Write a protein that binds this ligand. Structure first.
Ligand SMILES: *C[C@@](*)(O)[C@H](CCCNC(N)=[NH2+])NC(=O)[C@H](Cc1ccccc1)NC(=O)[C@H](N)Cc1ccccc1
Ligand SMILES: *[C@@H]1O[C@H](CO)[C@@H](O[C@@H]2O[C@H](CO)[C@H](O)[C@H](O)[C@H]2O)[C@H](O)[C@H]1O
Ligand SMILES: C[C@@H]1O[C@@H](O)[C@@H](O)[C@H](O)[C@@H]1O
Ligand SMILES: *[C@@H]1O[C@@H](C)[C@@H](O)[C@@H](O)[C@@H]1O
Ligand SMILES: C[As](C)(=O)[O-]
Ligand SMILES: [Ca+2]
Ligand SMILES: [Ca+2]
Lengths: 101, 17, 254
C-alpha cells in the first residue's frame, strides 16, 4: 500500500503557490486566502456570495463560510457542467412548458 | 353544480349525482 | 380574472380547478404529481368533505380534449393559525388520492427555497396569475382558463398607494400586493389558490396564491396574494408527513 504509493505531490499540482500534502494515491492543496480549488487554480471572488445576483446560480445558491458558494438544483434537475446551470433529470421538470420546449 | 350548466363539457357530470 | 387574455392551452399546465360536488370551488396549483397548494379560505364552508375533486389538464370547460384528469382530494391541510373568515394565512396543502399523470398539458410548478424566493423571485416585477374567475358568468370566453400579468409591490408602497383611509385591512408579512391600482386588471372570486407564477433564468416557480382584496379591480386598490415563501418550510414538512385519516387537518404553525 505504502510502496505502490509513492509521492503524488511530485507533479506540483498546487498552483498560485499553495502547500501540497502528499497522501494515499492522492494529494491535497493548501491554498492562500486569495485562492481556491482542488489545485487552488482559481481566484476568490469576494462578491460571489449568494445575496449578490444569486452568486450567478441559475436556480439555487448556498454560502459556505470559507468556501466558494456552490449552486444547486431542484428535484428532477441536476447541476450542469459549469456548476451554475441546471439541466433536468426527468421528462417533465417543474416550471417548464412542454408545448414550448 | 357545473353539470347543471348547458354550455359545459358533459364530463363534468360524472362528479355530480 | 379581469382584464385578462386566455392562456394558450398548456401554457398554464399547473393550474388546477377545484370542485365540491361538481361545483366550482376555487383554483389551485400543482407542485408535484400528488400535491396541490391553494388558498385556505375555500374550505371554510365545506360540509360534504368526501366529495372534493381536483381537475387538472383543464382549459376550456365547454368542450373535451383528452387532457383532463380527475383525482380525489384526500386531505386539505391548513395553518393552525388560520382563523376562518380572516385574511391571514390563506394557504392550504392538498394530498390527492392518486397521483396525476404528468403530460404535455399537466405539469407541476417549481416551488423554490425560502431563500431563493426571498433573495430573488421577491425582486421580480412581473409574474402571472391564472384562473377561471366565476364560471357562471355568461361571457363568451367565460369558460376558458385566463392568465394575467401583474407587477408586485413592496407592501409599503401598497399601504401607501392604497386609497387606504378606506378601511385599510392589515397587510401582513404573510402577504404581498400585486396588480395595477387603477382598476384595469386583477384576480377575482373563483381565482383563489390560483398560482401567481414567476419566471426566472428559465423556470417558473410559485410565489403567490390568489387570496383576497377589496373588490375586483377597484380603483385605488390592489389584489393581495399569500406569500408562499413564508409557508415553504411548512409545506415541505407536511409532504413528508405520515398521511393522516380525516380530510381536513389543522397542522400546527409554524
Ligand atoms: C376565495 C377566493 O376565491 C377569493 C379571491 C378573490 C380575490 N380578490 C381580489 N380583490 N382580487 N377571495 C375572497 O373571496 C375573499 C375571501 C375572504 C378572505 C379572508 C377573509 C374574508 C373573506 N374575499 C374578499 O377578498 C372580499 N373582497 C371580501 C374582503 C376580504 C378581505 C378584506 C376586505 C374584503
Ligand atoms: C500531477 O497532476 C495530476 C493531474 O492534475 C495529478 O493527478 C491525479 O489527481 C487526483 C486528484 O485527487 C488524484 O489525487 C490522483 O491520484 C492523481 O494522480 C497527479 O497526482 C500529479 O502528480
Ligand atoms: C425523449 C424520450 O422519448 C420520448 C419518451 O418516450 C421518453 O420518456 C423520453 O422523453
Ligand atoms: C503551504 O501552502 C501555502 C498555503 C503556503 O503557505 C506555502 O508557503 C506552503 O507550502
Ligand atoms: C392591498 As389593498 C387595501 O389596496 O386591497
Ligand atoms: Ca503518497
Ligand atoms: Ca376542455
Amino acid at each position: 500500500i505504502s510502496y505502490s504509493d509513492g509521492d503524488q505531490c511530485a507533479s506540483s499540482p498546487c498552483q498560485n503557490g499553495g502547500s501540497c500534502k502528499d497522501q494515499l494515491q492522492s494529494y491535497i492543496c493548501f491554498c492562500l486566502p486569495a485562492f481556491e480549488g482542488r489545485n487552488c487554480e482559481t481566484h476568490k471572488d469576494d462578491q460571489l456570495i449568494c445575496v449578490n445576483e444569486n452568486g450567478g446560480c441559475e436556480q439555487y445558491c448556498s454560502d459556505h463560510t470559507g468556501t466558494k458558494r456552490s449552486c444547486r438544483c431542484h428535484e428532477g434537475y441536476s447541476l450542469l457542467a459549469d456548476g451554475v446551470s441546471c439541466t433536468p433529470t426527468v421528462e417533465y421538470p417543474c416550471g417548464k412548458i412542454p408545448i414550448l420546449e | 353544480a357545473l353539470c347543471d350548466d348547458p354550455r359545459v363539457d358533459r364530463w363534468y357530470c360524472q362528479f355530480v349525482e | 380574472i379581469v382584464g385578462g387574455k386566455v392562456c394558450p392551452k398548456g401554457e398554464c399546465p399547473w393550474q388546477v380547478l377545484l370542485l365540491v360536488n361538481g361545483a366550482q370551488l376555487c383554483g389551485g396549483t400543482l407542485i408535484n404529481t400528488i400535491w396541490v397548494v391553494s388558498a385556505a379560505h375555500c374550505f371554510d364552508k365545506i360540509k360534504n368533505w368526501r366529495n372534493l375533486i381536483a381537475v387538472l389538464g383543464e382549459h376550456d370547460l365547454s368542450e373535451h380534449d383528452g387532457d383532463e384528469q380527475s383525482r380525489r382530494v384526500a386531505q386539505v391541510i391548513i395553518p393552525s393559525t388560520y382563523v376562518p373568515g380572516t385574511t391571514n394565512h390563506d394557504i392550504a396543502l392538498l394530498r390527492l388520492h392518486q397521483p396525476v399523470v404528468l403530460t404535455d398539458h399537466v405539469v407541476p410548478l417549481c416551488l423554490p427555497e425560502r431563500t431563493f424566493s426571498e433573495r430573488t423571485l421577491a425582486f421580480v416585477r412581473f409574474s402571472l396569475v391564472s384562473g377561471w374567475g366565476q364560471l357562471l358568468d355568461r361571457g363568451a370566453t367565460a369558460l376558458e382558463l385566463m392568465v394575467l400579468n401583474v407587477p408586485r409591490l413592496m407592501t409599503q408602497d401598497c399601504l401607501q398607494q392604497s386609497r387606504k383611509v378606506g378601511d385599510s385591512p392589515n397587510i401582513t408579512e404573510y402577504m404581498f400586493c400585486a396588480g395595477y391600482s387603477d382598476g384595469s386588471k386583477d384576480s377575482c372570486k373563483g381565482d383563489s389558490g390560483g398560482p401567481h407564477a414567476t419566471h426566472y433564468r428559465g423556470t417558473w416557480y410559485l410565489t403567490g396564491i390568489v387570496s383576497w382584496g377589496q373588490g375586483c379591480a377597484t380603483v385605488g386598490h390592489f389584489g393581495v396574494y399569500t406569500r408562499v415563501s413564508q409557508y415553504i418550510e411548512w409545506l415541505q414538512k407536511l409532504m413528508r408527513s405520515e398521511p393522516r385519516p380525516g380530510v381536513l387537518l389543522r397542522a400546527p404553525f409554524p
